Design a protein around this nucleic acid. Structure first.
Ligand SMILES: [Mg+2]
Ligand SMILES: [Mg+2]
Ligand SMILES: [Mg+2]
Ligand SMILES: [Mg+2]
Ligand SMILES: [Mg+2]
Ligand SMILES: [Mg+2]
Ligand SMILES: [Mg+2]
Ligand SMILES: [Mg+2]
Ligand SMILES: [Mg+2]
Ligand SMILES: [Mg+2]
Ligand SMILES: [Zn+2]
Ligand SMILES: [Zn+2]
Lengths: 43, 177, 42, 162, 99, 71, 40, 38, 38, 124
RNA sequence: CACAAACGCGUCUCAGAGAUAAUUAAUGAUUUAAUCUUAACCUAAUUAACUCAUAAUAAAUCCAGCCCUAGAACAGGGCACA
């Protein structure tokens, strides 16, 4: 009934696919790892 | 532990009838365990190529409960094939007409879309009230617990519990209730 | 009133015969749980 | 608790107010320094629609509610009490607090549909004929956003729109 | 080509079958699959899911003992979490080093 | 446990002729068409009707005559 | 799974990583002479 | 390809959407509510 | 009635009521002020 | 008040003119009852659950061109073979004992009837 | 209309209950006034749909030949009156 105009992931109008909490916790885990890395690179 | 091959195999692949009450229960939480027992995904001997699968008898289908406003918001739709033959019936009207339709369509949609689907709904028995044939009743083995704990109203609470629950506030004496 | 054997069957008579087979097997010592044969050098 | 009695004795009307003995507050609250009645009894973020014994305390016999100036509650918790009383009333709890009209109980209708956790009213919701796909989905709300602040023993958030 | 690709997918399909069988035989004892797995690992018992499904099918008392061990480890971990202290160390919470 | 259900009753025995009575117990026979037989089998065995229909020559010829056996 | 718990307890993320299940030689002769070692 | 500044809100790359979501503002939440504190 | 997006009182006798899930400007002295949110 | 009667099986003879006292002309179709008998009675709970079923046969045909089970059940009933067999929905207070004949005086002059038949087949 | 039929230009028949969207009301709290209630409890006044009362079909194994207002073939109805 309702269509995405053109291709889903290219155009001016894209798919409204949201962010997920699993992706959120993955991002915070990666930030904590790189924060530890840039602590160990300090001195 | 020491059995012959044919009765050992018969005991391993024996079919079991389960009983399930549907009074004050959500159809999705009913259909989750109904789908599991219709698969035989509660069996450690489960295989998709085997004919393992158990019967489920659900009673009290008329006393089904929807969480939230799904009784009026949720629709069930079908098409008869002819032009102008699109029917969108509200779930309240569909349960008013055919009581077993809601649970039947929930289990029918939740079961995996293979060709075993029709065969395993052939092992499903749905009754609107507590009126089961005696041939079905003598087949039963155990009753599954209900997935939702039913809340009781004020009248089922005993007066011991009424005076056991402390009074939070003190109303003024000049007020009218 | 003590359980010595229990057997499956399609029919009650066949299950009773199989239970008798389980009881006879446990009495005689031929079980699935029995000691395997000793293949050793004495 | 004050009641009014209206008496008709031969073209003479007498209206009287009579005081009936009322129950009092329990003597030992666990948190005496709290102002607000719920927040001094430590029922904040604890109760739900299921707790009939507390929702029966702040209601009228005809199913109505009492004002916040009388109840003494904080405003957010008064709104939470109002939402939970409405949810229990549509859920079929408190059966004895309906008004009595003996002419109307006899003409039965279709049986009452069992329901719970109803944020809205049954008579004012349109059925979702159009629905939607996953990238725009019309979600049926179950429960209310006023009760998202309750404690989570599983740790997962309460899914309010499904 | 389908033979090679289904040979690649055979390990995944058999692993999914083993996880379904372990989930079935653990829910038969009233214990969930992830809790059962992590609490069996927390007792330093390293049995893979193939042989765990094998015990689940052919070995009911031994799988019941394993589920009892996992439930005991789960209750012990919950008790140690609610204790908020390092002094109580349980009988199954002790960690055995290599020798 | 519950006791064994005991069921044994012979209502076909006649006082006139036991040789006819024993034949009356062997006189039960019935023939029925394909479609009613399929729905009767489906109702009896709680399966769908599509299993009970037969199969083609090409399908019955590719079945293995000597399948492997374990144990 | 449970690699994180093994990381706090000091073991590898993988049970195959340097454990006593790994550097022991999995077979030996019945009379007791040692086996030839593993290429890995 | 759209310009840097448009009027149609310029729907973002998914990694940037994840960046926005992880770096949303969260308020300080006190332990006990100061209104029904003493 | 008039179907509108935002609602206001055109005189002091208009009142707000929430009926059928929607908001209503109802007015008794001037019935031409009857408005309904969309 | 809500009861229903037993219907008939007749033979469409032909058509005739008819006239009324106000001068208008109507057309009447001739329906002749030749042999009408109630055959068997199916109960309320075994047929539909609301109204019982009464079985009515039509005009009388030959013994030799009917089927064996049909002749056996009509031999038990007691009547010669009928042409067409129909089912009528009848309330329990209007039941008729099977083997009873019926006549056109079952219908009184001045009434409204419903007529069911196979129409003229025009083929493909 | 030169076939016993078909045909219209000719003739006959054509229906009850529930349900609603918008909109009016009755009782009554939050907000002891009021106020149709995405407050309950029972209420009514109410379009078109849409379902269901109700109607049709709804008796298994004689079928060679012949007829048929039944039919492409296969099917279907008659062949004791006379
Ligand atoms: Mg596009
Ligand atoms: Mg496209
Ligand atoms: Mg590999
Ligand atoms: Mg390598
Ligand atoms: Mg560019
Ligand atoms: Mg014709
Ligand atoms: Mg008032
Ligand atoms: Mg008024
Ligand atoms: Mg019908
Ligand atoms: Mg014929
Ligand atoms: Zn407070
Ligand atoms: Zn105005």
């Amino acid at each position: 009934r309702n269509r995405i105009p053109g291709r889903q992931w290219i155009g001016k109008h894209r798919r409204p696919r949201p962010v997920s909490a699993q992706a959120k916790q993955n991002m915070i885990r990666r930030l904590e790892t790189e924060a530890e890395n840039q602590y160990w690179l300090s001195r | 532990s020491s059995f012959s091959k044919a009765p050992q195999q018969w005991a391993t692949f024996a079919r079991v009838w389960y009983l399930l009450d549907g009074k004050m229960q959500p159809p999705g939480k009913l259909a989750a365990m109904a789908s599991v027992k219709l698969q035989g995904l509660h069996k450690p001997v489960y295989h998709q190529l085997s004919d393992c699968g158990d019967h489920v008898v659900i009673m009290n289908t008329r006393h089904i409960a929807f969480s939230g406003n799904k009784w009026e918001q949720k629709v069930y739709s079908s098409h008869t094939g002819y032009p102008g033959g699109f029917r969108q019936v509200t779930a309240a009207q569909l349960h008013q007409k055919d009581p077993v339709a809601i649970v039947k369509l929930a289990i029918y949609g939740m079961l995996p879309k293979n060709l075993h689907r029709r065969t395993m709904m052939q092992r499903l028995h749905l009754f609107p009230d507590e009126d089961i044939p005696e041939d079905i009743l003598k087949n039963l083995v155990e009753e599954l617990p209900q997935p939702r704990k039913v809340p009781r109203r004020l009248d089922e609470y005993t007066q011991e519990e009424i005076e056991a629950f402390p009074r939070v506030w003190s109303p003024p004496e000049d007020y009218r209730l | 009133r003590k359980l010595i054997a229990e057997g499956p069957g399609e029919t009650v008579l066949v299950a009773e015969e199989e239970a008798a087979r389980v009881a006879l097997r446990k009495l005689f010592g031929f079980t699935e749980n029995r000691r395997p044969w000793d293949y050793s050098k004495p | 608790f004050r009641e009014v009695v209206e008496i008709l004795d031969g073209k003479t009307t007498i209206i009287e107010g009579r005081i009936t003995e009322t129950p009092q507050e329990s003597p030992n609250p666990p948190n005496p320094t709290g102002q607000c009645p719920i927040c001094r009894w430590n029922l904040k973020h604890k109760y739900n629609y299921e707790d009939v014994l507390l929702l029966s305390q702040f209601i009228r016999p005809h199913g109505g509610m009492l004002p916040r100036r009388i109840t003494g509650l904080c405003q957010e918790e008064h709104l939470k009490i109002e939402e939970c009383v409405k949810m229990a009333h549509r859920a079929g709890l408190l059966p004895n607090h309906r008004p009595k009209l003996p002419e109307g109980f006899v003409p039965k209708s279709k049986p009452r549909l069992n329901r719970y956790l109803t944020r809205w009213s049954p008579r004012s919701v349109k059925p979702i004929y159009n629905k939607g796909h996953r990238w725009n989905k019309v979600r049926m709300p179950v429960g209310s956003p006023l009760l998202k602040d309750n404690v989570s023993y599983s740790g997962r958030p309460l899914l309010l729109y499904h | 080509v389908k033979c090679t690709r289904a040979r690649r997918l055979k390990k995944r399909s058999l692993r999914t079958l083993w996880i379904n069988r372990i989930t079935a035989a653990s829910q038969e004892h009233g214990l969930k699959y992830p809790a059962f797995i992590i609490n069996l690992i927390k007792c330093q018992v390293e049995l893979n899911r193939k042989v765990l499904a094998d015990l689940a099918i052919y070995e009911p008392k031994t799988f019941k003992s394993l589920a009892a061990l996992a439930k005991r480890r789960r209750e012990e971990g919950f008790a140690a979490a609610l204790g908020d202290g390092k002094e109580p160390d349980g009988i199954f919470s002790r960690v055995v080093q290599h020798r | 446990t519950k006791p064994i259900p005991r069921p044994d009753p012979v209502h076909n025995i006649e006082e006139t002729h036991d040789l006819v009575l024993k034949t009356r117990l062997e006189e039960k026979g019935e023939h029925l068409e394909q479609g009613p037989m399929i729905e009767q089998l489906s109702k009896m065995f709680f399966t769908t009707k599509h299993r009970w229909y037969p199969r083609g020559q090409y399908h019955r010829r590719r079945r293995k005559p000597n399948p492997p056996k374990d144990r | 799974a449970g690699s994180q718990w093994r990381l706090q307890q000091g073991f590898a993320a993988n049970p195959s990583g340097y454990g006593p299940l790994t550097e022991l030689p999995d077979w030996s002769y019945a009379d007791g002479r040692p086996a030839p070692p593993m290429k890995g | 390809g759209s310009k840097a500044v448009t009027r149609h809100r310029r729907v973002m790359h998914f990694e940037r959407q994840k960046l926005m979501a992880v770096t949303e503002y969260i308020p300080p939440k006190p332990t006990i509510n100061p209104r029904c504190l003493p | 009635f008039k179907t509108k997006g935002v609602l206001k009182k055109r005189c002091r006798d208009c009142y707000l009521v929430k009926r059928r899930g929607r908001w209503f400007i109802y007015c008794k002295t001037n019935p031409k002020h009857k408005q309904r949110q969309m | 008040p809500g009861s229903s009667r037993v219907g008939l099986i007749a033979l469409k003879l032909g058509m005739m003119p008819l006239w009324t006292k106000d001068g208008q002309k109507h057309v009447v179709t001739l329906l002749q009852v030749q042999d009408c008998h109630v055959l068997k009675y199916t109960p309320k709970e075994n047929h539909n659950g609301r109204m019982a079923a009464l079985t009515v046969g039509g005009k009388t045909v030959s013994h030799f061109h009917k089927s064996a089970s049909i002749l056996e059940f009509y031999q038990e009933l007691g009547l010669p073979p009928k042409q067409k067999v129909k089912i009528f929905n009848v309330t329990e207070n209007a039941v008729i004992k099977p083997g009873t004949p019926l006549y056109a005086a079952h219908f009184r002059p001045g009434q409204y009837v419903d007529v069911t038949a196979k129409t003229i087949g025009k083929g493909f």
